[model samples]
Target: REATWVTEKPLTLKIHMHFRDKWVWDENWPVAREVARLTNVKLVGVANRAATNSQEQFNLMMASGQLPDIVGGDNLKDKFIRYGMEGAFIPLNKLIDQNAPNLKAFFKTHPEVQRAITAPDGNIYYLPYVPDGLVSRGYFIRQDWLDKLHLKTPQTVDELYTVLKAFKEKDPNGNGKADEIPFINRDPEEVFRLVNFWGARSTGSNTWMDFYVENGKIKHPFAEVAFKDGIKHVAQWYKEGLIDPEIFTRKARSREQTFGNNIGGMTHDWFASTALFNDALSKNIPGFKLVPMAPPINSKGQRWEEDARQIPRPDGWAITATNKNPVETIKLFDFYFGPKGRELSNFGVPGLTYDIKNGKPVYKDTVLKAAQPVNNQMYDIGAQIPIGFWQDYEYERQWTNDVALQGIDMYIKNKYVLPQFTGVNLTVEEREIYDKYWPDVKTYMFEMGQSWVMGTKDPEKTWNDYQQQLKNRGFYQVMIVMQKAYDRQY
Candidate 1:
């Protein structure tokens, strides 16, 4: 059957995009050209300046009322809701139902996705960039170092401490120098993994205001006795030279460099850390291997790892009220959600970026061998189109490689990792209150956490003071709002 078009004449649509430096949306990109050819929908890309005031530019564009047909960026979600409420962006429900079969079916299958994007006014103003799978972020250790030192992967926090002590004392890297950093980390939030081992959870980087539900009641992780105990244990690690002294000063890339250069024994980071380090170190260090270690057990024999939310709501394209051809625009966007569209968007057009091998699509060397300058060439070819709605794990698996997949599998199978908490929706008033005090609270918390971890501040002496400061900053009121929002979700 031939595809039906709302109009025989070609339609031109303009799209406003942020991050012009990172992505080019012109016809030079394969996907752009292909979509244009297929749909007769020529897209004009309008982008904000790379180094200038982007928010100001967007504000001007919105104020001018010369808005484009679609808009997309990291900042689009809040804009979509706010502008949609003011009738600047169109409500997608009727358009999606009438014109987007694949998207409509996707919403039907994933009601949570539907609920997430739908505004308080019962209108979906924007779409989401849904990831295919969940991977936990935790500790990655030097497997070869463990083998060289005749040590086993630590199963408990005490065992981990012992291992770190040995790594410091023993020349595990065989560099014939006592310069090994047993445990190195860049972000203070990585230290939250220790709190996780204590069977507690907290906000990333801002551990001071960590919240979790216990027995249907929202509880603060920082208020728990275990959090203080966890801090004490970590403080001891810092004092005893088991932790890297430069942790507070080092940048993330520099920390990765240290790990790659074989000076660090363990680091808390993403699941892809092993592959990342290996890619950097393999040529310089023979037989270098980093392995993801399971989240260590606590004194009570409880274990936990930081899990990724199943549905991470990455920003997606939204059709604005300025679009003249809503039916044609939606139909064009809908193509990417179907099976054929997904394959093309993910692997690229057949015979070029991918080939059929044993009745399966296997990406060609052109894509696999491409380096950083062209590393995301697949995206250029329209792979993962950002707008497409589908569940495809093969793309992630292929990108990370089998060794990395082993670590991901370990995390997936782990029984102790808590179920990821989805984001709670806040009312306009709640958002106002959260924005007013949360920034200062996060800053104070981060500074205090660093002070405690570096042993500059005593946990016992400063713990009560920290709680009082949080109280004074309206932490409890924010928690109440969050609890109400969270409870409403259930």
Candidate 2:
């Protein structure tokens, strides 16, 4: 079915896409060129640079009245709605029903994708990147350190506190220096993101403003009592140097730096990349072993791995109104949902990167043995770029080590990996309400969380004023808007 579509003559379409750090689409990319050769459509990239800011680029295109045939980026949700409503981007409902069998069948199978892609205005403006599995990031601690120190895997938050305290004083590395940073996280607002493990709170893309079902009603966790208690534990950990003091201001590669130097003991990070370090750092630290483990149960008696990559991921591409050949364009777009494109886009050109073994794709030794990480190597080769294709977790599975795979399977088997806000999208009007008030609200909320953990503010003393401030600052209204949309969808 995927290989059946072909155009008589070559057709070219202009596309504008933005990526933050990864390789952007280019004619030289092997996967894109292979797909182009298959379908006889040359996708000419217009804004393929990493620094091409989509907001200004879209506005300037709107001012100039000249648009690429397709537009895509990370924060285009509101833009797609506004432009589609204004007729700058064409609606794809009629086009998909007419020409896109792959997407039509795909939507038929995943009704949540339909709910996610359709705007409140009742138009499907974009095709989304579907996730294969939900869990990727998790809590990773050093198993070798635990074995050497005669400590079991932490089962409770208080046990974790004692273990981390020992990691500080016991010299697990035996390096004769009090230099171990036992626990750390990547993002600063994780002080709030980590709060979900304490109770029934759900947070995803926007952690500060998350909706979770509590007692059959939607509630935002930032206003709850559990949130305050969660931060208190972190504050005590921060004061005792169990949590990294530089976590708030650390640079991007702090994990690599700390873990490589054999000074880092525990972290919450990605499974594969975290496992890769065991091999890379084994030369210096003889028994270095980073292992994934279940999150410790807090004092409130709740344990959850709430952070999951949302299905029907927030970013995707939309067809523009200026395309003269809507039928052919929709057909080209449908190619991504087809088998050939999924194989190429998710796994690169077949035999060069992988080989079929036991009825599944396996990476060639060249890719597996590359000095650079497997994911980064594939990203460089243009296989895993964010596009209209479905992301297969098999790609990640090929690169993940046995230790990390066991952890992944353990988490999934225990059923601790449920994301409640699986396929929630706001309407244009809902987004308008969010855009008007949420930025300032989230900023203040994050700042206060950081200050509380840093011991600069007393979270207990600030409770009443904080609640009053949130109410006065329109968070309740934001919650109302969120609940209204949640009710409509679910």
Candidate 3:
């Protein structure tokens, strides 16, 4: 239910939360006022916090039957579902479908969001936060080092072996010293992250997306054979001494120190993740060109994985059943998808953060340069506005700067980015049970697989044990649930 416009009088809405020292309600009220003014209604701001201690917060609030107008955070979805089942969150599907035109249009235009938010019961309890577009993950290599060794770009995993071996033995740095780890992954899970590539090993899946479509059915990426193959490839790289030995042992800052020392010849990273390293490496090593290499293609030459941007269905905002006016909440949330709403939510005013040039939104120069005075954290005015959770992908592309850029030459390395089976939402009870078991299951799977890859355990035996453990943890049950969820759509 959305708030109806009645009169020109102001509407005071109270938001119960704080962000970065400032109150969330204080900043968004003006924009709400303006929107409410159009409908001749008043806007109000209210902020409150439960007991300071962690244990008291949930118990006290849940027992009292009083909650904020809105709650936002990483774990909000789980809370919403658990509480919704307990009658804490109101279902807004009918209201949203009828009144939220922009949100309705978004769901119609983007199948991915529909796939993500729709629950097992076909009810969406919360909105989701989606990135503007796809993210590119690839291998980052030092072209200067390759050139120093008189080598061409490595195209395949086998070729990668030869090049990295040379990097280890040949002293490509030319300081007459042997110092290079060939390939280094900052995050130990980087190799596991590469599991997304088994379907198509050309592009890496750095971030986690639980559900994807395969053979016209929604499925988890970890259950696929391709995922196992990806692990095998990384293990092979480790066996060949191509992977950094210290990758599994060292801390992140120490790893960066190694990179800064010019010891790392290659590694995996997001386009933006390597920006600082690339900038620094350029200063330290002359003619250093860090290029992103696509995931190593297997002998089959098929690349089925997609970029990070392709997955946009993140957990969005939801209205608590405790709120007095669900209608007003939906109406306020709907504004974020509007033109003016998007502008206020993402960027502040036009003249302040950006300007219209040739009928296109262009950021001020201050925002463009790195480490310059135009700090979005401080003076940038968008701090106070509460933009509804989701944004239009098209509008995001127009305003955001992190699209493909010249420095992002690494994107070319990916041969193909495949779209997986997407759009499966689990129910509250399912997520809760799985959440407890998921970590142990993932840990056992990774450890057993890594042991096999590193030759510490027999591959067949280890895999069998892994399978047995998965069965014990209800992997088959999980897969069946996923399949059932996927089957619902087609």
Error of 1 at 420 (Å): 1.8
Q: After superposition, how far is residue 244 of candidate 3 from its true place, in Å?
A: 4.9
lDDT string, candidate 1, 174-239, tens digits? 778888888877654666455665555554221224456667676666656677777777777888
- lDDT value, residue 106 of candidate 2: 94
Q: How big is the RMSD of model 3?
A: 6.6
Write the residue-wise lDDT of candidate 2 on 268-342 in tens digits.
Answer: 767787777777677888898899888778556766776666676666788998887778888888988887778
Top-TM-score structure, candidate number: 2
Candidate 3 lDDT, 186-212, residue by residue in tens: 556565554533442322232343445
- RMSD of each candidate relative to the true structure: 4.8, 3.6, 6.6
Determine which window of 10 residues in candidate 3 has minimal summed lDDT: 371-380
Which model is ahead, 1 or 3, in terms of TM-score?
A: 1
TM-scores of all predicted structures:
0.78, 0.86, 0.70
What candidate 1 gets wrong by more than 4 Å, as runs, is 1-28, 42-69, 74-79, 86-88, 177-191, 204-211, 220-256, 268-273, 276-283, 312-314, 321-328, 348-352, 356-359, 369-391, 423-474, 488-490
Please report, in order, the local distance difference test score of every candidate based on alpha carbons: 0.69, 0.75, 0.57
Q: For model 3, what is the error of residue 462's alpha carbon versus the real structure, in angstroms, after optimal superposition? A: 3.0
Clashing pairs in 2: none
